[PDB]
Amino acid sequence: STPIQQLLEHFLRQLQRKDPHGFFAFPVTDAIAPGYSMIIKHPMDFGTMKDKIVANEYKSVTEFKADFKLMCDNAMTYNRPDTVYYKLAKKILHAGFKMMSKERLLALKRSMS
Amino acid sequence: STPIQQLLEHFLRQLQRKDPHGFFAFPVTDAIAPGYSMIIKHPMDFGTMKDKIVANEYKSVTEFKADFKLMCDNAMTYNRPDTVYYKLAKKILHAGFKMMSKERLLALKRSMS
Numbered sequence: 698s699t700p701i702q703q704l705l706e707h708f709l710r711q712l713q714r715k716d717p718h719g720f721f722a723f724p725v726t727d728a729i730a731p732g733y734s735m736i737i738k739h740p741m742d743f744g745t746m747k748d749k750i751v752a753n754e755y756k757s758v759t760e761f762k763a764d765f766k767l768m769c770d771n772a773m774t775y776n777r778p779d780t781v782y783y784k785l786a787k788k789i790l791h792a793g794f795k796m797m798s799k800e801r802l803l804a805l806k807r808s809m810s
Numbered sequence: 811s812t813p814i815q816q817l818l819e820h821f822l823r824q825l826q827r828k829d830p831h832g833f834f835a836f837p838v839t840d841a842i843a844p845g846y847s848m849i850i851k852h853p854m855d856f857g858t859m860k861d862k863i864v865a866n867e868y869k870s871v872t873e874f875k876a877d878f879k880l881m882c883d884n885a886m887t888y889n890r891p892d893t894v895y896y897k898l899a900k901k902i903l904h905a906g907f908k909m910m911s912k913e914r915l916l917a918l919k920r921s922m923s
């Protein structure tokens with residue numbers, strides 16, 4: 698493993714801790730969600746993200762954050778605001794952007810010296 | 811080696827990065843996957859594709875792509891959608907369609923002036 702894979706595994710672990718039930722842990726199949734595939738064209742979930750970390754597909758924290766955002770944006774588009782899925786997506790999104798803020802990453806860069 | 815062999819080795823290396831465990835590295839046999847030769851008439855894998863590049867058997871990207879798509883198609887026919895092998899095939903197929911799209915190859919041709 699590389700140091701960047703470890704850092705991303707850390708962020709992913711901390712995010713998934715906020716989805717106890719695993720709503721975001723696996724892909725959304727049409728069996729689970731009728732016609733999902735008709736609405737959401739670029740699906741994403743935590744499991745796909747872990748596989749990309751293992752394949753060493755992320756060049757940057759920015760790329761990881763873009764997948765994370767896409768996953769949350771999907772959930773807030775497929776699901777109405779009054780759902781558990783929409784509300785948790787929104788909570789998750791904010792937590793992730795605090796965790797991986799420019800300010801947090803600058804302070805981490807300084808500690809890499 | 812020749813320029814086309816070098817371009818194909820490049821595309822192959824980038825595709826193989828998507829399969830870090832090497833599930834697509836070697837041929838599927840009936841000893842590995844029950845009843846494979848019944849469903850799949852023309853097996854293909856990354857090892858075979860590498861051997862064909864080295865032997866200079868591919869005359870065009872189209873010919874190379876055809877093997878890549880065959881490999882993915884085989885896995886998406888034999889395996890159920892809920893399997894690692896299906897999901898990975900779909901992942902490889904998407905990467906390859908992006909990398910070797912008509913528009914990408916156009917851009918490459920333009921740079922060969």
Ligand SMILES: CC(=O)c1cc(-c2cccc3nccn23)c2cc(N3CCOCC3)ccn12
Pocket residue numbers: 719720721722723724725726729730731771772775776782
């Ligand atoms: C992220 C997301 O949008 C999502 C996740 C589920 C879901 C719910 C339960 C298990 C599960 N595994 C993978 C996804 N899920 C899920 C389930 C939805 N349903 C839609 C209505 O039918 C009942 C379940 C709608 C949306 N979702």
Ligand SMILES: CC(=O)c1cc(-c2cccc3nccn23)c2cc(N3CCOCC3)ccn12
Pocket residue numbers: 833834836837838839842843844885888889895
């Ligand atoms: C590409 C593909 O369809 C594939 C690859 C494997 C596989 C799995 C493990 C070792 C291996 N060596 C060569 C191929 N493999 C493999 C194994 C399969 N099995 C499914 C049934 O359980 C026994 C193994 C089903 C499909 N596959």
